[PDB]
Each structure stands twice: as structure tokens, then as C-alpha cells.
């Protein structure tokens, strides 16, 4: 039936209430996440095919990169609150994996400052109640789905995307099967 459980997606054993409709997990430390985001542009293509009223939620995770990973989760919370995801995603990916010039919390801050977010603004967001709660939000969502690895995507807290079960003969076909699967699951 073109979409089968256990193929293009799997079904969570214990679904998550109150989860975002479409939730993606990633790490700035994970090469596959870099691929997912800047090479295959999966997020952007999934977004393009989402039904009306359905937002694409993206959360960062802690388990890679030690203390810096946790610092990056807090930084992503800042990016979310200020709405500057599209201005920091690439230079954070490149700073960690390409140039490897992100070695401390201060280096993360430097990226935001060069992207146009002022130091006073960044530090205020960093210490804000909203970023504090967004950090907990990202951590809880990961625990709630019993996250095993990144990148990963979840629909309505019930469905885990399974690209390993999709057609990968060509990348354009693959990305569109991914987006269509997300779209299908969102109406399910």
C-alpha cells in the first residue's frame, strides 16, 4: 500500500503525548546530520510538502560532544527563541566539523555575533527563562521518544521515519520519498 509500517517508517511502542507534529532531532557534531541538513536538505524538502498548519520542529541533542554538546543544545535554544536558525545552522555545522574552530562555549557565541546577533542580545537570550525551558523541552522530547541516534524524525509522537527502508537508487527520489512519508504520516 505504498506506505507500510516497518518499511518507510516504524511505530513507537509508547507514543508521546504533547509532542510537536513533526519533530526532528540532530547534533552539530554528527556528520550524518550535516548531510541531512546541508547536502540532502531533508528538513527543507519535508517543510515544502507539509499540510497547512503543520510546523517543522527541530531539536538539538546532548549525547555527542561532551560539555560542548550540552552547550550547543542551549545555543540551539537561543537560535530557536531569536528565530535565527537559518543564520547559524551552517556556520555551526562548519565550525564543528569543517574548520573545527568551535572548541568552547565562547566560540559558539562568536558564531552568533558574526551572524548579526549582538553579544548583549546573545547573552540575554542564553540566560533567559525561554531558553532555559527550551533546553528542558529538547531534552524531554528526546527521552520521551527513547532516542537512540541522530538524525531522526518523528510524526505526531507516534511515528519514526525509517530512511533505511526507503528507495535510495537516486537521492532526489530518496528525498522526495522522505518528504512524502512525513506528509502522509502527518495526515494519519
Amino acid at each position: 500500500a505504498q506506505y507500510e509500517d516497518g518499511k518507510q517508517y516504524t511505530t513507537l511502542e509508547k507514543p508521546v503525548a504533547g509532542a510537536p507534529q513533526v519533530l526532528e532531532f540532530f547534533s552539530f557534531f554528527c556528520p550524518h546530520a550535516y548531510q541531512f541538513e546541508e547536502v540532502l536538505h531533508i528538513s527543507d524538502n519535508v517543510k515544502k510538502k507539509l499540510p497547512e498548519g503543520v510546523k517543522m520542529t527541530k531539536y538539538h541533542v546532548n549525547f555527542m560532544g561532551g560539555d560542548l554538546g550540552k552547550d550547543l543544545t542551549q545555543a540551539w535554544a537561543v537560535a530557536m527563541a531569536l528565530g535565527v536558525e537559518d543564520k547559524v545552522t551552517v556556520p555551526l555545522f562548519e565550525g564543528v566539523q569543517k574548520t573545527q574552530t568551535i572548541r568552547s562555549a565562547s566560540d559558539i557565541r562568536d558564531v552568533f555575533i558574526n551572524a548579526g546577533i549582538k553579544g548583549e542580545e546573545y547573552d540575554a537570550a542564553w540566560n533567559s527563562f525561554v531558553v532555559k525551558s527550551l533546553v528542558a523541552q529538547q531534552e524531554k522530547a528526546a527521552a520521551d521518544v527513547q532516542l537512540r541516534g541522530v538524525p531522526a524524525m518523528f510524526v505526531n509522537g507516534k511515528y519514526q521515519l525509517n530512511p533505511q527502508g526507503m528507495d535510495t537508487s537516486n537521492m532526489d527520489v530518496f528525498v522526495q520519498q522522505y518528504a512524502d512519508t512525513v506528509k502522509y504520516l502527518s495526515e494519519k
Binding site: 547534533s27 554528527c30 556528520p31 546530520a33 537512540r148 541516534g149 530512511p163 526507503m166
Partner: peptide, 7 residues
């Protein structure tokens, strides 16, 4: 294209 970093 389906690879992941697992915990």
C-alpha cells in the same frame, strides 16, 4: 543517506 550517530 540513512546513517546515524547512535548513543
Amino acid at each position: 543517506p540513512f546513517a546515524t550517530c547512535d548513543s
